[PDB]
A = this chain, B = another copy of it.
Amino acid sequence: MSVVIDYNVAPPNLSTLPNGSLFETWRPRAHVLPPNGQIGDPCLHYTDPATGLFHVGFLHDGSGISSATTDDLATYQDLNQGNQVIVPGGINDPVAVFDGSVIPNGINGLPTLLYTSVSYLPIHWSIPYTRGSETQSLAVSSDGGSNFTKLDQGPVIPGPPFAYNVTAFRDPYVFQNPTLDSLLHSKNNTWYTVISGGLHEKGPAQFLYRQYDSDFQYWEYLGQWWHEPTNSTWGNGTWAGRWAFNFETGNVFSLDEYGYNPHGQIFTTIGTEGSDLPVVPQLTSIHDMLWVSGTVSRNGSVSFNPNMAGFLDWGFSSYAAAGKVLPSTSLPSTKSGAPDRFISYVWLSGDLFEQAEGFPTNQQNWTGTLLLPRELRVLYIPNVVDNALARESGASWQVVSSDGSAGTVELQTLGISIARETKAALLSGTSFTESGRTLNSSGVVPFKRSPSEKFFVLSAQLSFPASARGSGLKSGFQILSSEHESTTVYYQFSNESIIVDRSNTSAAARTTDGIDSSAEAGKLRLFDVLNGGEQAIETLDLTLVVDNSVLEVYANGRFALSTWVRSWYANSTNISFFHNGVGGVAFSKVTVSEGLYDAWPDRQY
């Protein structure tokens, strides 16, 4: 007959169930992930100039790269039924295919992938590097992006600069930039490539190259344009993790206030691989997903000089973001009226980067997802009170101007928001509002109405009184609640953090191994702001997207924290206000939009 899963009945040890039986249990409907199996780093994204279609890529099942297309930046169509567009086992990549990026109009006017071809394993920053384990090779797709055919020749970058003792040398990221062109006297619209890694006994680095010939064959090395001492940190480690022991997945792009701009301010996103001391061999224990703003100067060699940094996503399991310029002329942008954008997809590892021992993987028959596509832009925060909170150095914002008479500053930071078409589609269900209210005493106050399924967007503003500052206040929402389970998301002033408490999230965690229930946290400063003569603590503007087990928490256009919320009971759908009674908090009207949408309309599962 069939395998019988009834989510009103208590879970077994989930490891005892048949393979595939929990395929739908925690599976999102509005996120990019393959038809089944494991997803790794995103990469390979490009806009096809001939069609305007946006292609997304990701590592799949540890055997190369799979891909999908989108004509709206909301929904996707698989290429090759989800099967890889390039796989290991060639002359240059006999052991593995790691991340690569695409020159959309490359050799013969075709999408041209420059990627890390792997010949020797293991590879880790903590151990000696095997010579030639990572090279960079070319492949070209002449069939619309379903198959990237390896050029029948050796790698175009056959290793690091002479005698460099690299920790890593991978994830080539191709990009154009007119500011670099002027500084370096490059031909206009030269392609640059950064390769990510570092050097033993020195620290993490991005290795910079430029196209030497129009055939993409030779790549002139321009030095370690950005490097940091081993396990150093931006500021004192508060706002942007650590530079740690190795850089991965370096992206480079340039922004203004609306989106992507070639002449704009220059940013990079990187993963950093961290560790406690002493180092455990071959173990990266901390996977930080950072963004960094910087100025670019030259003294013989070009240099990127960070002036602020933060997290692109604060989630423990968030890492390895890959993004791409998406021009206004693309199919999605033409329909939505968007200007040029930089769209970034963060990876949410499904199994704690392969440390989640005993998770029911064969039952689920999939592992991991990408997060919602995110638009990156320069965000300005006006009318901020010029005080110590605003003026802190080594943080994730900087003062760009002053008004002495008003007593204020204008702050600059990285804007992070859900890509506009995806956001509209997430909100396309049916909506209802809960009335605003002030809470002063301790407890959870049920919503009058809660969603009946685990697929929703909750939006709300939280306004705090002056005395909340430095207090023991905790305020937010309890979600996915029933008598058996609950998840609490709250702001906490004591350490200026958004917290996701997962201690009670999953009844399955009580009966099964490998179901992480540890707290998640990200730093967020609410500044003192001036609005029509009166000073107040900045409003907390919250968006929670729950897509079955995938939780993404956005705040104030500049913050994201994402995690797994693997609730079991069909019942666990209630929402409540939460406040710990330390001070007062005023909640606006809360909007709940239920159902999301189907990001994979041509799949049945």
Contact = CB atoms under 8 A, between A and B. Distances in A.
A332 interface: no
B91 A120 contact: yes
Contacts of A154: 119-120, 130-133, 135, 159
Nearest to A221: B162
Contact of A132 (B94, B153, B220): B153
Nearest to A131: B153
A436 interface: no
Contacts of A91: 94, 119-120
Nearest to A133: B154
Nearest to A219: B162
B217 A131 contact: yes
Contacts of A163: 212-213, 218
B212 A153 contact: no
A153 B122 CA distance: 11
A163 B94 CA distance: 25
Interface string A132-169: 11010000000000000000111110110011000000
Interface string A71-87: 00000000000000000
A518 to B, nearest CB: 39
Given A162-B218, A218-B163, A152 B212 contact: no
B153 A120 contact: yes
B130 A152 contact: yes
A388 to B, nearest CB: 52
Interface string A214-243: 000110100000000000000000000000
Contacts of A120: 91, 152-154
A156 B133 CA distance: 12
Contact of A156 (B131, B156, B213): B131
A154 B157 CA distance: 13
A132 B158 contact: yes
The majority secondary structure among interface residues of chain A is loop
A558 to B, nearest CB: 43
A158 B130 CA distance: 14
Contacts of A218: 162-163
Contacts of A92: 132
Nearest to A90: B94
Contacts of A94: 91, 94
Contacts of A212: 163
A499 B261 CA distance: 77
Interface in A154-207: 154-156, 158-159, 162-163
Nearest to A134: B154
Interface in A102-145: 119-120, 130-133, 135
Contact of A158 (B152, B159, B213): B159
A92 B95 CA distance: 12
A155 B130 contact: no
Contacts of A132: 92, 153-155, 158
A154 B154 CA distance: 13
A496 B332 CA distance: 82
Contacts of A131: 153-156, 217
A215 B91 CA distance: 27
Contacts of A158: 132, 135, 158-159
Contacts of A135: 154, 158
A132 B132 CA distance: 13
Most B CB contacts (10 A, CB to CB) among A92, A119, A131, A156 go to A131
Nearest to A151: B131
Nearest to A95: B91
Contacts of A119: 91, 154
A212 to B, nearest CB: 6
A130 B159 contact: no
8 contacts: A92-B132, A119-B154, A130-B154, A131-B154, A131-B156, A132-B155, A133-B153, A162-B220
Given A92-B132, A120-B152, A132-B158, 5 more contacts: A91-B94, A120-B153, A131-B154, A132-B155, A163-B218
The 10 closest A-B pairs by CB, nearest first: A132-B154, A158-B158, A131-B153, A163-B218, A131-B154, A130-B153, A158-B159, A91-B119, A91-B94, A132-B153
